[PDB]
Amino acid sequence: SLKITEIETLRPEEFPNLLWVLVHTDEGITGLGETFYGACSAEAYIHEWAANRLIGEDPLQIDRHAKRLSGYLGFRSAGAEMRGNSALDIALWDIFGKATGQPIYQLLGGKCRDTIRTYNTCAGPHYARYDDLNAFLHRADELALDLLDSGITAMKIWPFDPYAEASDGYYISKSDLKRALEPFEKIRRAVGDKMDVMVEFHSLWNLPPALQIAEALREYETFWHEDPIRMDSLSSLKRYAERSLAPVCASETLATRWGFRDLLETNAAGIVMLDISWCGGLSEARKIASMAEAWHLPVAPHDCTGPVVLTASTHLSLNAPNALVQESVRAFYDGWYRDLVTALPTVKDGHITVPDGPGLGLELMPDIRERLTIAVRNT
């Protein structure tokens, strides 16, 4: 059986939010993990604390390690400790898969579907003619027809974002509200009943303007409202949910079963959203999904980040019987993902599936440190 010898972190300079982890074993089995945001603080944590708790150990003891890496502080949120733990955990699943010859979805309990429906989060490119941010801001009819043509039947937009800063999310003017409604009018004209529109709010709003916005959005029969208020105290959420026609999607900012227990006790969510690289790994995300199912709620795994999180989320979305949609960004997977990894999640007719092979079914391409400026670190 395997022993963990070495942990490597990679911080690519041209994507400064991205962090890769490599876990090495004595038998030459290497796991790939990934998280996003606060790369340096996550990296610093893994070398300061986390690496010394798993060097020496069997990597297959995945539940034991997740519990062991749950530290004295930072357990109740998606902080640097949590994001570092989550990336480590994805890699341990990659090892598990390679050691057994099994794709991650099988190790989670088997697939329930061959593909899952995808939705396009309309972000623009990282440094394209997928300029989807400015396309929703100005040309949202055109973006909708374009998306529908490729077979994508769902999109996520965030036009209320600019109005948050002026008032610290305490106020939206009535005419600023109707201006931010204009993307919703445009796509209603263009494609109508054929597109699901998700609204993202980025946790930017407090309670009175959130309610005011939700009432204005009733007309447009939006698919979900994501993070409409900050998920700090969750007792404030039922107030929002009561007044929103669309279900609350919550929340990528939330970590672990305990974060999600707290959400499910509100009776306010309609969609349980998680990011596997923020929430405590595939380990916690496994268990969160199966909890959500007991409350009759679907899970939507978060991407919008690196290629590995998209792949790992897709594994979870293939496994979970309550999985609904898998988030993807067309600007990302046709764009800057392409150089970075040996295989990608395959998008066809508005649906997405895993790359073939054990574990993730991808690696970092062998010429990665030559292609990008990569700050590596070793323990």
| Token pair for 189 | 């004209």
- H-only helix segments in the chain: 39-45, 51-54, 62-68, 80-100, 104-107, 132-138, 140-150, 174-180, 182-190, 207-217, 237-242, 256-265, 281-294, 307-319, 330-331, 368-371
Quick one: what does residue 262 bind among Na ion, its own copies, none, with the CB cut-off 5 to 8 Å set by partner type? its own copies
Spatial neighbors of 257 by CB under 8 A, at least 6 apart, are 280, 284, 287, 288, 291
Find all residues with CB under 8 Å of 146, minimum gap 6, and list them. Answer: 135
CA angle at residue 368 from 34 to 26, to 5 degrees? 65
**CB of 114: closest distance to Na ion in angstroms?**
26
**Which residue, 20 or 224, has its beta carbon nearer to Na ion?**
224
Q: Which two tokens stand for residue 45?
A: 């944590």
Omega cis (within 30) before 251: yes
Nearer to its own copies, 254 or 341 (CB): 254
Return the residue of 12, 31, 33, 247 that touches its own copies, per CB under 8 A. Answer: 247
Buried-exposed string 184-202: b where 16+ CB fall within 10 A, e elsewhere: bebbbebbeeebbbbbbbb
- Name the residue nearer to its own copies (CB basis): 295 or 346: 295
User: CA 337, CA 333: separation in Å to the nearest integer?
Assistant: 5
Which of residues 13, 168, 182, 219 is near its own copies by CB under 8 A?
Answer: 168
Task: Name which of 51 and 143 has its Cβ closer to Na ion.
Answer: 143
Binding-site member from 122, 143, 271, 312 for its own copies (CB under 8 A): 271
Residue 363 binds its own copies (CB under 8 A): no
The region that residue 353 occupies, defined by phi over 0 for left and psi between -120 and 50 for alpha, beta otherwise, is beta
| Helices 307-319, 281-294: inter-axial angle, 10-degree rounding | 40
Partner from Na ion, its own copies, none binding residue 132, C-beta < 5-8 Å depending on class = none
Q: What residues numbered 188-227 form the site for Na ion, per CB under 5 A?
A: 200
Site for its own copies, residues 279 to 318, rule: CB under 8 A: 283, 286-287, 290-291, 293-298
Separation of alpha carbons 379 and 376, rounded Å: 11
Per CB under 8 A, 324 contacts its own copies = yes
Strands 4-12 and 374-378, bridge-based pairing: antiparallel
- Match 């990302």 to its residue by tokens: 332
Q: Site for Na ion (CB under 5 A): how many residues? A: 2
Q: Which does 8 bind (CB under 5 to 8 A by kind): Na ion, its own copies, none?
A: none
Q: Which is nearer to its own copies, 33 or 247 (CB)?
A: 247
Binding flags for its own copies, 133-162, as an x/- string (CB under 8 A): --------------------x---------
| Least spacing, CB of residue 268 vs its own copies, in Å | 9
CB of 144 to Na ion, least distance (A): 19
Q: Does 270 sit near its own copies (CB under 8 A)?
A: yes
Q: What residues between 47 and 76 interact with its own copies by CB under 8 A? A: 47-49, 58, 60-64, 67, 71-76
Binding marks (x or -) toward Na ion, 237..256, rule CB under 5 A? ---------------x----
Told to check if 343 binds its own copies by CB under 8 A, we report: no
225 binds its own copies (CB under 8 A): no
> Would you give the end-to-end CA distance of the chain in angstroms?
21
111 binds its own copies (CB under 8 A): yes
126 counts as binding its own copies under rule CB under 8 A: no
**CB under 5 to 8 A by kind: which of Na ion, its own copies, none does 174 bind?**
its own copies
Longest C-alpha distance within the chain, in Å?
65
Q: Kindly list the residues in this chain that would bind Na ion in the complex (CB under 5 A).
A: 200, 252
